[PDB]
């Protein structure tokens, strides 16, 4: 189960 | 054993008003088990191992939803990175991510990973503490400031310690299994009274393997030629190692193959 990157983006 | 999961994510911008291509590949113990690719006709996560064919469509749908999330996060990131590096439009750029967890045989987290790269080079990475960031670059400092302000690390830590671990565990119950190398040594002329001996290992899984040459006991780390382990194309792997020896002296040289599928390391020599 993969990650869901939070904001903020890069 | 030292079980692992990884997700390897890539977005690649292309010239000419196109959206960035986004690809995510999931690995369990270095075997690819899922894949999502925005270029496909219906972008969705797909099983890439047969032991995944037992999940219901809610799994695929959930994961596919996350992927659309990542796509967008990557797309905006890519745009920001253009500006951070003062780069022109109509170029081609890559943002990559690696995420995942290492587990013990007690099912306990060992290490969590989260690393980004821009153009194939380290950009930023969550340290082993799972609280602080290492920025590679000038640009990445700005990203590091954002993520310190926001507490981003907390989010990634919870994922790496929770979901990543729990799901790795489930995927493994869903699936240990190895193929031992078949080894042989081949003999190859050179000139100047010398001969190449080439110890081959074939048909082995997993891909981790060590090949040594001995001159009557002593290991030849130095004079030995290797090749990078390579896929046979059928799920298994190949490797060889070779030494140049004097002609007639062949029987003095012993190849050893070490692989976790083997009850003992294999030991072998040139057999005419």
């Amino acid at each position: 189960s993969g990650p869901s990157n939070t904001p903020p983006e890069i | 054993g030292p079980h692992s999961m990884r997700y390897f994510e890539t977005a690649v911008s292309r010239p000419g008003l196109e959206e960035p291509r986004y690809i995510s590949v999931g690995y369990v113990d270095n075997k690819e088990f899922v894949r999502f690719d925005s270029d496909a006709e219906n972008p969705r996560y797909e099983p890439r191992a047969p032991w995944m064919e037992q999940e219901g469509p809610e799994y695929w749908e959930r994961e596919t939803q996350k992927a659309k999330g990542q796509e967008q996060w990557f797309r905006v990131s890519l745009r920001n990175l253009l500006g951070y590096y003062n780069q022109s439009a109509g170029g081609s750029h890559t943002l990559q991510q690696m995420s995942g967890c290492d587990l013990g045989s007690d099912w306990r987290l060992l290490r969590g990973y989260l690393q980004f790269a821009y153009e194939g080079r380290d950009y930023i990475a969550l340290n082993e503490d799972l609280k602080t960031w290492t920025a590679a670059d000038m640009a990445a400092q700005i990203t590091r400031r954002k993520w310190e302000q926001s507490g981003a690390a907390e989010h990634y830590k919870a994922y790496l310690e929770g979901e990543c671990v729990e799901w790795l565990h489930r995927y493994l119950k869903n699936g240990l299994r190895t193929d031992s190398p078949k080894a042989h040594v081949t003999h190859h002329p050179r000139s100047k009274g010398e001969v190449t001996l080439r110890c081959w290992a074939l048909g082995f899984y997993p891909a981790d393997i060590t090949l040594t040459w001995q001159l009557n006991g002593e290991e030849l780390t130095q004079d030995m030629e290797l090749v990078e382990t390579r896929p046979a194309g059928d799920g298994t792997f190949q490797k060889w190692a070779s030494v140049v020896v004097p002609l007639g002296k062949e029987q003095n040289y012993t190849c050893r193959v070490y692989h976790e599928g083997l009850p003992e390391p294999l030991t072998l020599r040139w057999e005419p």
Binding site: - | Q96, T186, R198, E228, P231
Partner: protein, 99 residues
């Protein structure tokens, strides 16, 4: 920074003249991921060469496996031509059954 492809050409099974087999062209350590890979039989492009999906390694570099069905003979010579932006001219690596 560009990174230059490393290439191995080799068969799936120990080659035996006249017996069908698979010839691999395993291309690694490259960046950017755009790449063109051809496999040639006696200097002429083999049609309909399979290409694995592309992946990348722990060091960020990309890799890919090309393959085709083939039946090695005594004299048929096989190669793998790689065009990539890290290199001025395309790299051709010839199959050596001993390697």
């Amino acid at each position: 920074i560009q990174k230059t492809p490393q290439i191995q050409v080799y068969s799936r099974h120990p080659p035996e003249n006249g017996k069908p087999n698979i010839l691999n062209c395993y291309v690694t350590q490259f960046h950017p991921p755009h790449i063109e890979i051809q496999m040639l039989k006696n200097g002429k492009k083999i049609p309909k060469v399979e290409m694995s999906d592309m992946s990348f390694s722990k060091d960020w570099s990309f890799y890919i496996l090309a393959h085709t069905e083939f039946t090695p003979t005594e004299t048929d010579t096989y190669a793998c031509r790689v065009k990539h932006d890290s290199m001025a001219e395309p790299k051709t690596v010839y199959w050596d059954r001993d390697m």
